[PDB]
């Protein structure tokens, strides 16, 4: 071990450096704020077009259309206001674990156990939906994909790799290495300049899209991280794992800020999201229901129990009017 | 609402093709193909008519068989083994000639008792094949079974050694009342593997019709 020793002391130095900036805790400051009371939300729409477990769901930027991906090899573009179906795209593989709707609205993305990201074009002549591109180059199942614009995309796979592609060519343009486990989640910043990915290392990272180097690394969980989300402000992020605990971090102090746990919760987290103002935290569980936490006081205020099987996805509209939950019983529910 | 009555008409035409496709895809047999590597899966897929995962489709006696090979998937099994829930059967390919090479059989039984006692495959039947048996006789006549099983107090013959190996595999399941383990001794020249699979899946289909019909 010629140089396998100073890493430990450097880790200790960063540990007690971030411990130095611990004048107070968020709990002490938040003790003076009034609680939100009781949160009561009810189902408004139910979408019934899937014949298998739902693994992915995404909102569009108009907060009306949403894309859903199931394990029966079908992408469905709903219309949440009228529960109509606009497009039913059949895929060449029925093993799908992610989906995403482009911000412009002219494309969708999909992927799964085929190790290939399929990008589909919705706005074209001939009146059909065509596979615009197929992106290959990864060595594992695809966990998450997010659009930056209509020509760029970020991918996270089980081969301990996140990549930044371009659509016209087909090539990657940057590869993010460092995770020792496999990435199961990914979330871009609101300004879309740096994204957070959390793998099975019980840890999360911060990457730089422009450069391609891991700026910061966050730890504190004791099991694989399944879900991650960025706070609306852009200087914090929530997460969830299998130890039934969520925790809100912050990019400025570079350490965990709060924890959200209960002594009647023993399952894992499958999805995490915020609200428009960042006051509520929506977490999906394996107990066939979802929980709503106060993001400042870490106290439960309500539950969303309407699914026969465990919820796999969970999203919130851009305008914050409603939230959508998709579970393993092939039913999407919109709560408002 | 003149152009919104056509929207409703479209959503009913495409909801009529999801139902037809669902009914067409519910009449098919689905078989996962597991097994430690270097085992004989490449031979088994060659026996029948015949990248992340590789699916294989073939027909036999007015039946449709889909076989999912998930081996070029080096990753954590816990993150994608719940996708294959509901598969009709699991085909496990274990070779008999790896009793001395490195200990391999041991790992094979570890894999077997990992998948067999899983939380998602509690009532999924396991067809077990042993394609390697031609040179197994030569290897067992040249070297005894004490390499892998020091507790084997038996003769050095194929008939007893194969059965002794078989009991260890059939004694790793903790559900003796919900799932069955069908066994076969496949050889390179044997063409009855399709028939064995068809009979096992026919019994599985009979048992499934029986739960769904609502009876015992």
């Amino acid at each position: 071990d010629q140089l396998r020793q100073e890493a430990e002391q450097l880790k200790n130095q960063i540990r007690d450096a971030r411990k130095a900036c611990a004048d107070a805790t968020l709990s002490q400051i938040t003790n003076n704020i009034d609680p939100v009371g009781r949160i009561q939300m009810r189902t408004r729409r139910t979408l019934r077009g899937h014949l298998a477990k739902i693994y992915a769901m995404h909102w569009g930027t108009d907060s009306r259309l949403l894309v859903s991906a199931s394990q029966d090899g079908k992408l469905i573009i709903w219309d949440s206001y009228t529960t109509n179906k606009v497009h039913a795209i059949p895929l060449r593989s029925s093993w799908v674990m992610t989906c995403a709707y482009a911000p412009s609205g002219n494309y969708v993305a999909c992927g799964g156990l085929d190790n290939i990201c399929s990008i589909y074009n919705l706005k074209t002549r001939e009146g059909n939906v065509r596979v615009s591109r197929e992106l290959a180059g990864h060595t594992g199942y695809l966990s998450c994909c997010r659009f930056l614009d209509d020509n760029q995309i970020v991918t996270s796979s089980g081969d301990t790799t996140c990549a930044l592609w371009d659509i016209e060519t087909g090539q990657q343009t940057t590869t993010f290495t460092g995770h020792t486990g496999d990435v199961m989640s990914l979330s871009l910043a609101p300004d879309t300049r740096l994204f957070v990915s959390g793998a099975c290392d019980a840890s999360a990272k911060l990457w730089d899209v422009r450069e391609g180097m891991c700026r910061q690394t966050f730890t504190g969980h004791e099991s694989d991280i399944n879900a991650i989300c960025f706070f609306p402000n852009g200087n914090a992020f929530a997460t969830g794992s299998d130890d039934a605990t969520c925790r809100l971090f912050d990019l400025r102090a570079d350490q965990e800020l709060m924890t959200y746990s209960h002594d009647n919760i023993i399952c894992g987290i499958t999805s995490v999201s915020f609200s428009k103002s960042g006051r509520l935290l929506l977490a999906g569980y394996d107990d066939f229901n979802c929980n709503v936490w106060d993001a400042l006081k870490a106290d439960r205020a309500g539950v969303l129990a309407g699914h026969d099987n465990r919820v796999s996805c969970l999203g919130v509209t851009d305008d914050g009017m409603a939230v959508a939950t998709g579970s393993w019983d092939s039913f999407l529910k919109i709560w408002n | 609402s003149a152009e919104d009555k056509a929207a409703v008409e479209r959503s009913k035409m495409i909801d009529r093709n999801l139902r037809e496709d669902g009914e067409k895809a519910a009449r098919e047999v689905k078989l996962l193909l597991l097994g430690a590597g270097e085992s004989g899966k490449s031979t088994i897929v060659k026996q029948m008519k015949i990248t992340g995962i590789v699916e294989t489709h073939f027909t036999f006696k007015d039946l449709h068989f889909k076989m999912f090979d998930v081996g070029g998937q080096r990753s954590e099994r816990k993150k994608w083994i719940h996708c294959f829930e509901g598969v009709t059967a699991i085909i496990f390919c274990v070779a008999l000639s790896d009793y001395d090479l490195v200990n391999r059989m041991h790992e094979s039984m570890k894999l077997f008792d990992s998948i067999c006692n899983n939380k998602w495959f509690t009532d999924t039947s396991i067809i077990l094949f042993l394609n390697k048996k031609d040179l197994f006789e030569e290897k067992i006549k040249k070297s005894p079974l004490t390499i892998c099983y020091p507790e084997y107090a038996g003769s050095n013959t194929y008939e007893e050694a194969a059965a002794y190996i078989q009991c260890q595999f059939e004694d790793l399941n903790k559900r003796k009342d919900t799932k069955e383990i069908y066994t076969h001794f496949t050889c390179a020249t044997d063409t009855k593997n399709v028939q064995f699979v068809f009979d096992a899946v026919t019994d599985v289909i009979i048992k499934n019709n029986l739960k769904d019909c609502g009876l015992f």
Partner: single-chain antibody
Amino acid sequence: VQLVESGGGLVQPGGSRKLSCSASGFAFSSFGMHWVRQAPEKGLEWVAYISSGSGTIYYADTVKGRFTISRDDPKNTLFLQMTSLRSEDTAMYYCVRSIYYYGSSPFDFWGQGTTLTVSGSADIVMTQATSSVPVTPGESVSISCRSSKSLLHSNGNTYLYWFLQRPGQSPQLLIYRMSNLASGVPDRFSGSGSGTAFTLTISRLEAEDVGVYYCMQHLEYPLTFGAGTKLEL
């Protein structure tokens, strides 16, 4: 995307005839289809509509009973069969495609037409007050259209369409729903309205926007066009 129609010619009055339109380049089975006729010296008039899957059929009075619309999806063909052909049924007939979902663009593509010669009150009346606006190149023009009933439905959408017919050619879609520009249209055209009066603005007029402009509604079953407005250099 191509739409070629055939049939018609010299037909004695009181006879029968059939027109056939063939499509090449788009999914014919996923598009509703319309037959629209135009008199030699008059505006466009909507004749018939057949929904995809052939589950919905509409016709217009002047032809109701004596005309039939059908489609052959495997052969990608549309048939119009007419009988008891009068002397008022001599016109040019165009085939139009239209697909309806959230955010679609109906009436996007028009055919070429087949010449043909045979020698109520609830419908909304669309009136274009002006009929000829001579404007020099490089000027801003405004064309006004009127409606008897408010086209603003109770969902946010108002159904009013602006087409353009250059001389010697078939109409083209410029604007749908009064505020959306069709694909392939320069950015110069604009549409405004308040539910009853609508305005089209051809800003920076160039050497192509010469022809007749028709304002169409799609709020209610029978579809009605305007009288037309001519633009001259």
